[PDB]
Amino acid sequence: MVPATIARFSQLNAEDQLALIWFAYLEMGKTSMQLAENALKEIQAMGPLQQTQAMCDLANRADTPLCRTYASWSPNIKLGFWYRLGELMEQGFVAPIPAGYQLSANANAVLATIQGLESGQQITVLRNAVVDMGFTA
Numbered sequence: 001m002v003p004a005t006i007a008r009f010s011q012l013n014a015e016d017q018l019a020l021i022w023f024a025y026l027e028m029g030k031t032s033m034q035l036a037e038n039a040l041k042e043i044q045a046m047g048p049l050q051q052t053q054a055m056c057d058l059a060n061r062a063d064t065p066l067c068r069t070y071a072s073w074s075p076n077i078k079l080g081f082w083y084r085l086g087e088l089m090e091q092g093f094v095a096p097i098p099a100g101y102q103l104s105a106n107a108n109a110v111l112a113t114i115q116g117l118e119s120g121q122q123i124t125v126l127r128n129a130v131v132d133m134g135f136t137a
């Protein structure tokens with residue numbers, strides 16, 4: 001199911017992908033950054049609208065300096081980066097998702113599948129979910 005889940009995730013639109021990994025992040029709680037630390041500080045320094053745009057840019061695979069930087073990182077550093085962004089959003093340092101937002105049926109189906117996998121399999125899916133975000137020419 002891991003390759004199938006990765007494949008389906010890759011078909012979701014950017015909004016669904018980004019929403020899914022947010023809710024995946026929140027679920028983990030119920031259970032070092034190498035050269036990415038600076039990028040996190042850059043995002044913390046942006047205003048709320050620009051922070052949201054930055055994260056949307058990554059999921060949309062837009063051509064921006066942050067997206068090019070992101071693309072150069074290892075898979076585990078990309079994961080750690082998103083984890084830290086999640087923490088920062090929870091803490092109020094980075095703009096939160098829209099209030100009252102509901103995960104689409106399509107995204108929910110994928111999230112439900114992920115939650116049924118073994119923990120290692122879940123991380124494999126999430127690692128592959130974020131590895132091709134940002135920009136490659």
Ligand SMILES: CC1=C(/C=C/C(C)=C/C=C/C(C)=C/C=C/C=C(C)/C=C/C=C(C)/C=C/C2=C(C)C(=O)CCC2(C)C)C(C)(C)CCC1=O
Nearest residue numbers: 015018019021022024025052055076079082083085086097
């Ligand atoms: C604007 C806007 C939105 C906004 C959406 C937004 C802003 C969404 C933001 C979503 C974010 C910030 C999601 C973060 C997810 C992080 C995960 C799952 C991390 C996993 C890490 C792992 C497994 C780490 C593992 C590891 C650790 C810890 C190590 O330390 C090393 C080991 C290892 C590698 C195994 C919406 C899309 C909702 C609506 C539309 C709309 O307009």
